[PDB]
Every structure is written in C-alpha cells, then in structure tokens.
Amino acid sequence: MIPGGLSEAKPATPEIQEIVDKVKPQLEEKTNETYGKLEAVQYKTQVVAGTNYYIKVRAGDNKYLHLKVFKSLPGQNEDLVLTGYQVDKNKDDELTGF
C-alpha cells in the first residue's frame, strides 16, 4: 500500500536523482550495485495545497531511501514541508508499482 507514487511518477529524474547525489552522496554510491539503482528511484507529483511530491530515492537493489517533497501552501502559505525523508540500508525498502 506504499508504492513509488505510481500513476503520476517517473523513474529517477535528472533532478530527483541529483537529490540522491546531494544529501545522499553515500547512499548514492554505497550500494555500488552493478545496475542502475545508485540514484533517485522516482518522484510522483500530486497537489494537496502547495503541490505534494513523493521522492522515493533508489539506493540499489538492497539499499533504498525515500522522501516526500512538499511546497506547503494551503492558502495560509506556511513555508514548505517534507512528510517524506529516509536513509537506506534495506530500511525504507518496499515493493513498488512502477
């Protein structure tokens, strides 16, 4: 019940994956897997009241991180928010829909 924001979401963007090389400069080259799972995993986009963002970051087939970028602004305009955020180490691991 917690996929990578399927439906509206892409496979690690050139932007989202940059987040994996910024705050995750270890989780991005740690798993050092022999595939393409060393970067962002995907980012789904859905409004809410500012524009919610589901940044599921990829850390390899064994490690995996996650985030939810949110530009909070439900009319009252109160800075942003990030109900999502996680490191890796088979912790935030979780099946995905896309």
**Number of domains, the chain:** 1
- Looking up residue 18, the CATH number of its domain turns out to be 3.10.450.10
Distance set, CA 54 to CA 1, 35, 92 (Å) = 14, 23, 13
Query: CA triplet 22, 50, 7: central angle to 5 degrees?
Result: 75
Cβ–Cβ < 8 Å for 53, 43: yes
Closest of 92, 19, 15 to residue 60, by C-alpha:
92
Beta bridge pairs of residue 54: 44
Do strands 63-64 and 81-86 pair parallel, antiparallel, or not at all (unpaired)? unpaired
Domain range for 92 is: 1-98
Question: Among 59, 29, 63, which residue's Cα sits nearest to residue 41?
Answer: 59
